[PDB]
């Protein structure tokens, strides 16, 4: 529908992967209807985080929240040239909810500093 080409490099390192109409309530129609609703729900579910973090229309957006070393103690050579995006998630999956809240407020405080900056 979109693409599973992102998934091509699921075993590659993090540095390599990153670099008709009419509705009929038949058993297949109800099946194919929820698939259409379940797609736009899961799509906007991710797309509203990108918007609220100030990253809509971006694939790679840099933030302003420093990397708290308690989230991971590994080196940049141990991450981007060793771990895969699939296993790196399992190591950091505890702090993902703790990180998503910091990127959410780093964008919020950046917005009020701009409304004071452009007022000159």
């Amino acid at each position, epitope marked *: 529908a979109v693409f599973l080409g992102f998934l091509g490099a699921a075993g590659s*390192t993090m*540095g*390599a992967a990153s670099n008709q109409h009419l509705l009929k309530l038949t058993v297949w129609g109800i099946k194919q209807l929820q698939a259409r609703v379940l797609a736009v729900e899961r799509y906007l579910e991710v797309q509203q985080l990108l918007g609220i973090w100030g990253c809509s229309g971006k694939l790679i957006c840099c933030t302003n929240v420093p990397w708290n070393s308690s989230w991971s103690n590994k080196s940049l*050579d*141990e991450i*981007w*040239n*060793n771990m895969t995006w*699939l*296993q790196w998630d399992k190591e950091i999956n505890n702090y993902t909810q703790l990180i998503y809240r910091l990127i959410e407020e780093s964008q919020f405080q950046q917005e009020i500093n701009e409304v004071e900056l452009l007022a000159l």
Partner: nanobody
Amino acid sequence: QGQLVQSGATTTKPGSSVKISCKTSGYRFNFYHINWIRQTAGRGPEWMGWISPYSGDKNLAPAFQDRVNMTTDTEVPVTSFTSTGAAYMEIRNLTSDDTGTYFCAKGLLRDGSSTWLPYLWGQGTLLT
């Protein structure tokens, strides 16, 4: 983690062609190079060569260019990131100069400048 248990400390006589095994545990066997380095009793530590358990590519030392046969059988998957492979290595016209402890070590990373660097060493097999 990971452990690269080696073969047995078997000693033959000059002219033989002993094989040394090196089976791994606790890590993806295909994701890292295997490396063999000996420590001759009358020489400095000598690097012999590495092979890629994934690509199947070899690169050895000039002093072992036509004297060493090293191979690897495929890995037996255990989980999404653990495998159980094995690494074998032979010598051709073996003499008494090849006497010493032999080591097998796995690569440092799987990308970058120091990809194959012998990071995790095994246990050692004493020869003739």
